[PDB]
Amino acid sequence: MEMEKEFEQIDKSGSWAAIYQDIRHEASDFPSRVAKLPKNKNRNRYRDVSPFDHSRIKLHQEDNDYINASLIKMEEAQRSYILTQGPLPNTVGHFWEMVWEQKSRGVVMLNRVMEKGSLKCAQYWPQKEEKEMIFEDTNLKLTLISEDIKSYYTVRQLELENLTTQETREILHFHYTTWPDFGVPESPASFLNFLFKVRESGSLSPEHGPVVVHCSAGIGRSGTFCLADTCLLLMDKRKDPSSVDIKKVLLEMRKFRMGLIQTADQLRFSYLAVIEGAKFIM
C-alpha cells in the first residue's frame, strides 16, 4: 500500500502495536559473540543491545578492537551510517578513535546527557574553548572551536587532533536537544528541519566517512533518524515514490543492527516524518 493512506488505515483501526510486533517477529537474528566476551562487559551500556559480529565497527588496535557500534550500509539509497550507544566513562577515547579511523565528518546526538534524572551518556566533548580534552588511552586531543545554540538544536565546530601524527580535522557536532523525556514529539517539523541541517553540512555525503549517530542505546531515536533519511532519499531517486515501503526499509536496516525503532510510537512517528518530509522536498 501507499504510505499516507496505510497510515490513516492503521490509525483508524488502532493496530500500531500489532504492526510493530510483526516487524519484531520478522527481524534478523545474527550472532554477537564479541560483544558478550567477559573482557567487554564495561564497554556495553545495556546487556540486551549489542552489535552483530558481521557488521560491527572494529577499532584499529591489537589489544581489544571492540566498540558497541554498527555499520548500516544502504545499497540502493547509496548511504551509510554508523549507529552507536552513548559513550561510557571508559569508552570516550574509543569513541573518538572510531570517528578518526572511519574518517567521519559529523556526529549526530539525539539525547541529553541527563534525562529522567539519570545519566544517559558521558560528557564527551568540551564545553569551553579554553578547556580542551585529552584522551590519553587513544592519544587524541579535542577542542571546542565554536557553538551555535538554537531553539531545538545546537551545532558545534570541534577540532580533533591525532597526537601521534599531529594531523588535525574539523568535526561537526549536531545536537538535537528537545526530544521529550517520555514519548515522541507531537509534530515532526523540528526533527525534519534538523535532518536537513545535517544534510546541508556535507556530513552525510560520499566524500566523507559515514556519519556517527547515537542516543542512549543507539537503536531508538537513532533508528528513526536513519530510517527517515533513507526513505526520503529513495522517494527522490525512484520513478514511483509511492513504491517506497517503510516497513521493508526498516527490516533491511535491522539486518545490520538489532532493535532499531524501540516502540510502536516511534514507528508511527517515523511514518509521520517521512509523509510530511515528502511534501516539503517538492
Ligand SMILES: OCc1ccccc1N1CCOCC1
Ligand atoms: O574531564 C573529562 C575528561 C577529559 C579527558 C579524558 C576523559 C575525560 N572524561 C572521562 C570520564 O567521562 C567524562 C570525560
